[PDB]
Amino acid sequence: GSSGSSGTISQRPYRDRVIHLLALKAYKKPELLARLQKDGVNQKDKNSLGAILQQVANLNSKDLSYTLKDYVFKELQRDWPGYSEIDRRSLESVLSRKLN
Numbered sequence: 001g002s003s004g005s006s007g008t009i010s011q012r013p014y015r016d017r018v019i020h021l022l023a024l025k026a027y028k029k030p031e032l033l034a035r036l037q038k039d040g041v042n043q044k045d046k047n048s049l050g051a052i053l054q055q056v057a058n059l060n061s062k063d064l065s066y067t068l069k070d071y072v073f074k075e076l077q078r079d080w081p082g083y084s085e086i087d088r089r090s091l092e093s094v095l096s097r098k099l100n
Contacts, residue, residue: 007081009039009040009081009082010039010040014036014041014042014045014048014049014052015052015055015056016075016076016077016080017036017039017082018032018036018049018052018053018056018057019056019057019068019072019075019076020076020077020080020082020083021035021036021082022053022056022057022066022067022068023068023072023073023076023091023094024087024090024091024094026057026060026063026065026066026067026068027065027066028064028065028066029049029050029053029059029064029066032049032053032066033046033049053066054066056068056069056072056075057069057072070098073094073095073098073099074095074099076091076095078091078092078095
């Protein structure tokens with residue numbers, strides 16, 4: 001039985017941080033960042049992002065917006081520190097709509 005620990009977002013893998021955002025809704029290469037960058041986005045990752053968005057999300061030429069895949073929803077984390085009192089309840093839906 002541990003007491004506590006330092007759970008920071010940075011310690012988490014970029015991918016997760018990304019999908020966790022695209023989950024609630026689709027985000028644009030630049031936009032999505034504006035959300036992560038805030039907490040701190042690694043330069044070496046800034047480039048990888050584009051690749052991840054396609055590995056976990058899908059870009060729609062329509063509105064050049066990236067859409068979080070379906071299966072990925074399972075990879076997400078219901079205990080993500082990125083989901084506010086609302087987000088959390090706003091995400092539990094999708095997963096429920098996707099994850100049969």
